From a paper:
Following assembly, the anthrax protective antigen (PA) forms an oligomeric translocon that unfolds and translocates either its lethal factor (LF) or edema factor (EF) into the host cell. The first α helix and β strand of LF and EF unfold and dock into a deep amphipathic cleft, called the α clamp, which resides at the interface of two PA monomers.
Indeed, 2D classification of cryo-EM images of PA channel bound with EF showed that the EF binding varies in different classes, suggesting that the space is not fully occupied. This change in the orientation of Phe464 appears to restrict EF α1 in its elevated conformation in the α-clamp site. While in the PA7-bound EF structures, the HD domain contributes to a new conformation by bridging the PABD and ACD.
Numbering used by the authors:
A (entry chain C), B (entry chain D): 295 to 343
Write the structure that this text describes.
């Protein structure tokens, strides 16, 4: 059984460069993520000797 | 055969600038998931002592 909790710190940038539209910025923030996982697995083996 | 659920509200913060008028944009997103993984495996080993 597995459960994942991750927060990713998201950062971008906003730069426009054209003939009549320019402007600069920088962004910052953090996200959230909560997971949950069950796992079922079996086996077999036959070993002669 | 495992099944992964991940429930997130990923919130990003973005501020955008222009030539005269500057605004911003934040947004978070709720969601669901059934990202399941199935597997099939075969093996073979020979030892000698």
């Amino acid at each position: 059984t597995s459960r994942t909790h991750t927060s990713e710190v998201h950062g971008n940038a906003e730069v426009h460069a054209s003939f009549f539209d320019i402007g600069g910025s920088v962004s910052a923030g953090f996200s959230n993520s909560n997971s949950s996982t069950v796992a079922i697995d079996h086996s077999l083996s036959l070993a002669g000797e």
